[PDB]
Structures are given as structure tokens and as C-alpha cells.
């Protein structure tokens, strides 16, 4: 992260470089969910939200017209999204310790 | 002593005083007047003259009634026996296992 | 619509027809070492002028 | 010997005496200033006959000595973080809930109160410790502790949160309405001259 | 029921026919020794010992 | 008596300085700055 | 150690101070004084004699809180383990990376 | 000490390189008393105290999280602390305490 | 005695390690019972006197 921080600037547009959404303290929803959510929140950014042409080699009625932004970054002001997102939760059948 | 049932204790309990009184001219002056007995450039007179300069005693020559309670308890130890012998006063020893 | 509103946090103990329970946060001690009112608090000062 | 002292123990029910952690980073001594003031003759000593006491006082006391004050400074402290904590209800379901999250043990139970008036009132993890780091500051005063855990949360390079937040919620999950009072109520009233928050 | 805390809201109220006896009886449990946990039914408050 | 010599008040001069051992957050005097969000029951713009 | 989570750090910074200010002046106090101690006319000398005249330090005497926070924390650490043997107390030692 | 005070500068941080402790009159000590002092203040600087993991392989509650500062400079202003830390207070009166 | 005095601290009671009875002028006892009540001063610290 140290290392992206150092590429950060303003861009010709007046622009910065990216688009940082800090978090403090992180929603306590179960960690795969955490995992596909930042996957989500990835694709958001690109072109027609990263999909491909599904219909009649065109976009969809939802996916065509999005332009996108400049990329998101995660940027954790605490280590609570860090070690969220590499939580490990499955594996474990015990009753008040399973997650479905 | 089958039946005493009443024991006695004393504290050396000991506070602060002098909130202002320069603890290093104290120190000089314990350790000035006792020259003539220990030696004064020692670690010793500079520790317990450090000690009186800085910590007084917290309710004493009022506890000198245990010290006196006590020597009139061993008075009487040896005065209730029916000869002062050593099979009649024990001392206690240190002993290991076995006694 | 239900509107929203904040949590409280107090006791939410209800013992049936008698209705919610006597909220007793901190017991007796705000009648012993006396009352607290943590909305207001002093930073104190650390540094200073020299 | 390790596992008779408790090595063993779920290190989530370890609590620190203050219900609270710590990031401290303050400005310190250079000794600059006491050197300048040196050389100008201003202020060559600055140590105060108060500190010559105290200084004396380090010399011939035993550090078991300190130890006794500090373990006795440390169990006031938690009386005064249980009286918080027995305020606030600071549990896991409690902190767990300041996060988006209903947190029970039981399963079904919480799967339920997802469409229902649960999630209309709502409140924050900040708003929770602000409120926690305000009351115990006000109470540790009044027993004449006067700690900075309150100073230190208003300094823009030091950032206090409660202790319990490291933890995984989605969990442990039947140990989610028990409080984090940590001391016996008889090691309660032992500290708070007698005061008692349940019984 | 002292260390119940949370922000939901249940009714507290005693179940039916509740009053049932312990598994072992905690009073005549204690430990033999400080070092370690020894633990099990003890005895011996005699006039002597 | 004891004469020294001494620095003469003309050149040296007094000079107050202020030492904090921290920068004070924005909302110093406010104990729960977070109470403008937690009660805005509506929403915000 | 396994439940602590909470971190002190000290910042040993500075400031500059004043204006109109004469620091050749102090220099030649600095350096003229600590004479029979370090030579005068060195450039260490001359160094410490500048920082010392231009710059003054942010925290102070308010800030030796961190400094006996930690001369605390090893009086503690080292009176609580059973006895202080050199198995008891390790002290961190310059590994090559293997050990 | 004066190659010492030639490299004293100041950091990017905004920060002196070392702490300066600067002593002019010695507190009435023994000398091997002093010495040992003189221990604990080069150790307190260092990260967790100067100390290694003591108890399961990690540190105690009072060493972890100490993560130091610069290290202490004991700049004497008089020659009292040199002479001081160097003497032997065993059989010679060099003008300080008899400790046998 | 100097290297008794060096070992004179306030103990984890907040005690001092002993106990001093200054003695500045003596009383005229024959000097075998200045050592016969020495013994006794001695022993009245013992638990059960010794």
C-alpha cells in the first residue's frame, strides 16, 4: 500500500489518480462475504461494470452506458478491513460457530 | 496455651514527611555527627540518612506498649515454670527434616 | 412507516405482566461515590507555557 | 506449569482494566530546552524539592513495593470499567450490534429479527466508545484515579477504542449476551467502598 | 442473571416446574492444595484436624 | 558580598514558549462528536 | 502478552524559537563553557552549539510521561517473573536470521 | 562524544536524532549503583524494553507494545558524571562512598 | 553495622526492614546484664518470643 500511495497525484482532467473510500471500522457481515463484495467493488469501476457483451454480441439494458470512474481504493484506516478480508470462518460445524 | 485464643501484633509501618525540608542537608548533618562512630563516606550512613530525612514513623511510641506487653509475657514464661532449666525453656532451633 | 430511532442501552429486561424492569445501570454507586455526568469532561492540560 | 496458569484461556475473555486500548504517540522530551537554560544560568536546576522526596524515595523502597500500589491502582480501575460496562451494556451482542450485525445465540432466533423493528433504532461503535471513554473518565476521577484515556482520545495522533473489537462476532456467538464485568461482586464492593452494581 | 447485559428486549420469568436438584452438591467440593487443582468431595473439620 | 559577572539584560531576552505534547482534535471540547450522526433519525444530504 | 493491543510510542521532535536572535553569541557561551570538558573549536562542538541556540524541543519536560511509562513497565516486567534468572529474563539479541 | 554531537542532526521527521539528557551534578549514589542505571537507560529505548520473549514465545503484558523512542544521550555538562561511572569504590578514597 | 545500614528499605507492607532503638547514653548496669538484656532484646521479636 506504501508503495501506491507514492503513485497517487492529479491527473491532466484536474482528477486525482484513483478514488479512495477509507474505512474505519467494517461492517460485521461474514468474511466470504467481505471477499466478494471488495470483487464487486473492483468491477464497479470499469467500463460497463467488467462484464462482456451477453446479448447479440451488444451490452445489456444496465451494463451498456456505464463509462466507469477511476479505480476505488480500500483504503483501511485501521487494520480491522486487513485482517477481515483473510478471516477464515469455514470449516468449523460447532453450534455458535458455524456460518452458513 | 491450649486455650489463649488472643494474639498481639505490631507494624513497623513507616509514612512521609518534611514536604519541603532539602533531604541532602539532612543527610549532612547524620552523617557529620556520627563520624565519631561509623565511618562517615559509606554507603550505609548515606542510606539511613536518607531514610530519616525522607520517612518518619507512623504511630510510634504509641506501640511501645506490645514491645512491653511482650517482655512482660516472656517474664512471666520463665517465672511460671517450675525450674528454669533447659528441659523446663525450650528454644526454638532450626530444624531440617527429620528434627 | 416505523421510524427510526437510537438505541437506548439501557436494561431491556421485561418481566411479564409487571411490565419493563427497574433500570439500574450502575446499582448503588452513583448513590456511594456520587454522581458522574460523563457529557461533560475536562482534557487536562498536559503541556504548558515556558 | 504454563497450563496451570491459565495459558490455556480463549484470549477474547482477557479484558484490560480500562475496557479500552491505546495508541499513543506524544511528543516527548528533547532536552533542549533544559541545556539552553543551563548555559544562560536562567533555570540550571529544574528538578523541584517535591521530586528530591520522591527521588530519595525510589532509593531504599523495595520495587515489591510499587508492585502492591499498581495492583491495587489496577483493580480500581476495573471497578470503575464494570460500572461502565454494567452502564452501557457492553456485551458482544451489544458491540457486535453497534456493527451491523445481530449477534445471538440463537441461530434461527437472529434470522428473525432481521424483518422486524430490531434494525429500526441503530447507533454507532463511535458514538458507543465515546460515550463509554466520557462516563469512565468522569467516574475514575470521582474515585481520584485521574487517568488520560479521555486526554489522549482528544489528541489528533492518538486514537482510543474499546477492547473487544479485535475479535470475531460471527463466532462465539452463545457467549453473546454476558458482560464484560470481569471482577467478583465481593471484589466489586471491596474497591467501591461497599457499592454495588449487581449483587 | 448479573452478568445478562444486550440491547434486545426478552421477558425474564421462571420455567415450569424448574426446581430441580444440582448434579453434585458444590458446598462439599473444595481444593487440597494451592499449587494445583486438586478438586473432588472433602471432609475432615474435626475436633482435632 | 559575592560581585560576578553577569549578562547584561540588554542582550538577552525573555521569550514565552508554549509546549503541548499533542495536536487537539477538531470537536476538542465535544465529548461525543459522534451524537450529530447517531440522532439524525431522518438522514442527511 | 497475548491480549495487550495497545502501543506507546515518543516523539523526540523539535521547533525553531525566537526572532532576532544572536546565535553566534550563545555559541561562543556553549562552547567557552564546556571547556575543561570538550574541546571548544571543534565541529561537534560547534553543532550541538547551534541546535541547542536556534532550536527547542515540542513536548519538553511535559513529555517525559513516555519515559516513565517504560521505566515502569520494566521494573514490572522484571519483578513478576518467578525469579530473575538469565532463563527468566532474555535479552533481545542480534540474530543473523538464522538464529 | 564530540563525533557524536557532529552527526546530531535532525531528522526528516521533524525530529532530533537522539534524546538529550544532559546532566550536571550527580545524585548521591554508589558508583556500581550508578553504573547499572546507566543500564536501564540505553535498554529503555529500545523496542519492547531491550527485552526477548519471555512467557509462550511472545512478550509479557508490560514489554509488548513498547515500541521505544530515540536513544538516550547523557551529555554531561560537568566532568562529575565521567568520573563518576568510571570509579572503583573498593579500598581508595578517590572522593567518593566506601562501599565494601 | 555500615553495611546494615545499606541494607535498610521500606518492604512491600510499607514497613521499614527493622527496627532501630537508638541507644545515645546507657544506662550504669553491670555490664553482664547489658549483655543478658540484649539476648532478651533479640529474642522478643521471635514469633512466641523466640
Known amino acids: 500500500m506504501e508503495t501506491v500511495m507514492a503513485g497517487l497525484q492529479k491527473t491532466v482532467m484536474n482528477e486525482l489518480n484513483r478514488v479512495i473510500v477509507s474505512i474505519a471500522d467494517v461492517p460485521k457481515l461474514p468474511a466470504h462475504r467481505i471477499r466478494n463484495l471488495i470483487a464487486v467493488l473492483a468491477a464497479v469501476s470499469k467500463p460497463n461494470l467488467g462484464f462482456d457483451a451477453n446479448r447479440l454480441e451488444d451490452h445489456s439494458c444496465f451494463t451498456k452506458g456505464w463509462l466507469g470512474f477511476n479505480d476505488i481504493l480500500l483504503f483501511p484506516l485501521t487494520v480491522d478491513l486487513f485482517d477481515r478480508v483473510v478471516a477464515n470462518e469455514a470449516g468449523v460445524n460447532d453450534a455458535g460457530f458455524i456460518v452458513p | 496455651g491450649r486455650a489463649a485464643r488472643s494474639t498481639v501484633r505490631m507494624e513497623s509501618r513507616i509514612q512521609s514527611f518534611g514536604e519541603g525540608k532539602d533531604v541532602d542537608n539532612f543527610m549532612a548533618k547524620f552523617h557529620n555527627q556520627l563520624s565519631g562512630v561509623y565511618e562517615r563516606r559509606s554507603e550505609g550512613v548515606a542510606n539511613f540518612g536518607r531514610i530519616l530525612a525522607t520517612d518518619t514513623d507512623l504511630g510510634g511510641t504509641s506501640g511501645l506498649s506490645v514491645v512491653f506487653n511482650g517482655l512482660l509475657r516472656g517474664l512471666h514464661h520463665v517465672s511460671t515454670v517450675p525450674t528454669p532449666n533447659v528441659a523446663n525453656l525450650p528454644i526454638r532451633n532450626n530444624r531440617d527434616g527429620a528434627g | 412507516?416505523?421510524?427510526?430511532?437510537?438505541?437506548?442501552?439501557?436494561?431491556?429486561?421485561?418481566?411479564?405482566?409487571?411490565?419493563?424492569?427497574?433500570?439500574?445501570?450502575?446499582?448503588?454507586?452513583?448513590?456511594?461515590?456520587?454522581?458522574?455526568?460523563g457529557m461533560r469532561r475536562v482534557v487536562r492540560t498536559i503541556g504548558g507555557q515556558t | 506449569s504454563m497450563l496451570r496458569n491459565w495459558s490455556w484461556v480463549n484470549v477474547h475473555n482477557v479484558h484490560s482494566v480500562t475496557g479500552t486500548s491505546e495508541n499513543v504517540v506524544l511528543a516527548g522530551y528533547v532536552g533542549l530546552s533544559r541545556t539552553h537554560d543551563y548555559i544562560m544560568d536562567t533555570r540550571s536546576t529544574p528538578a523541584t524539592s517535591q521530586g528530591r522526596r520522591l527521588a530519595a524515595m525510589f532509593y531504599y523502597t523495595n520495587a515489591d513495593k510499587m508492585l502492591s500500589l499498581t495492583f491495587g491502582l489496577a483493580g480500581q480501575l476495573r471497578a470503575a470499567a464494570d460500572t461502565t460496562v454494567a452502564k452501557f451494556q457492553i456485551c458482544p451482542h451489544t458491540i457486535a450490534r453497534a456493527q451491523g450485525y445481530i449477534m445471538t445465540d440463537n441461530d434461527p432466533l437472529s434470522d428473525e429479527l432481521k424483518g422486524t423493528d430490531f434494525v429500526t433504532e441503530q447507533f454507532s461503535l463511535a458514538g458507543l466508545t465515546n460515550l463509554y471513554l466520557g462516563y469512565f473518565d468522569g467516574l475514575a476521577t470521582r474515585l481520584g484515579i485521574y487517568d488520560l484515556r479521555y486526554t489522549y482520545s482528544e489528541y489528533a495522533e492518538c486514537r482510543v477504542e474499546l477492547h473487544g473489537i479485535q475479535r470475531n462476532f460471527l463466532t462465539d456467538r452463545l457467549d453473546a449476551f454476558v458482560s464484560y464485568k470481569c471482577l467478583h461482586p465481593i471484589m466489586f464492593e471491596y474497591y467501591m467502598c461497599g457499592a454495588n452494581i449487581s449483587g | 442473571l448479573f452478568w445478562?447485559?444486550?440491547?434486545?428486549?426478552?421477558?425474564?420469568?421462571?420455567?415450569?416446574?424448574?426446581?430441580?436438584?444440582?448434579?453434585?452438591?458444590?458446598?462439599?467440593?473444595?481444593?487440597?492444595?494451592?499449587?494445583?487443582?486438586?478438586?473432588?468431595?472433602?471432609?475432615?473439620?474435626?475436633?482435632?484436624? | 558580598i559575592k560581585t560576578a559577572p553577569v549578562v547584561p539584560p540588554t542582550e538577552q531576552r525573555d521569550m514565552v514558549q508554549e509546549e503541548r505534547v499533542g495536536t487537539p482534535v477538531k470537536n476538542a471540547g465535544n465529548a461525543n462528536p459522534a451524537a450529530d450522526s447517531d440522532n439524525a433519525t431522518e438522514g442527511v444530504v
Open chain 3, 1 to 37: 412507516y416505523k421510524e427510526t430511532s437510537r438505541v437506548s442501552l439501557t436494561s431491556m429486561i421485561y418481566v411479564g405482566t409487571a411490565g419493563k424492569d427497574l433500570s439500574l445501570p450502575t446499582g448503588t454507586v452513583e448513590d456511594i461515590i456520587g454522581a458522574v455526568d
Open chain 5, 4 to 49: 445478562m447485559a444486550g440491547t434486545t428486549r426478552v421477558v425474564l420469568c421462571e420455567a415450569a416446574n424448574g426446581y430441580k436438584p444440582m448434579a453434585y452438591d458444590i458446598s462439599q467440593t473444595s481444593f487440597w492444595n494451592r499449587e494445583n487443582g486438586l478438586w473432588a468431595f472433602t471432609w475432615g473439620e474435626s475436633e482435632k484436624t
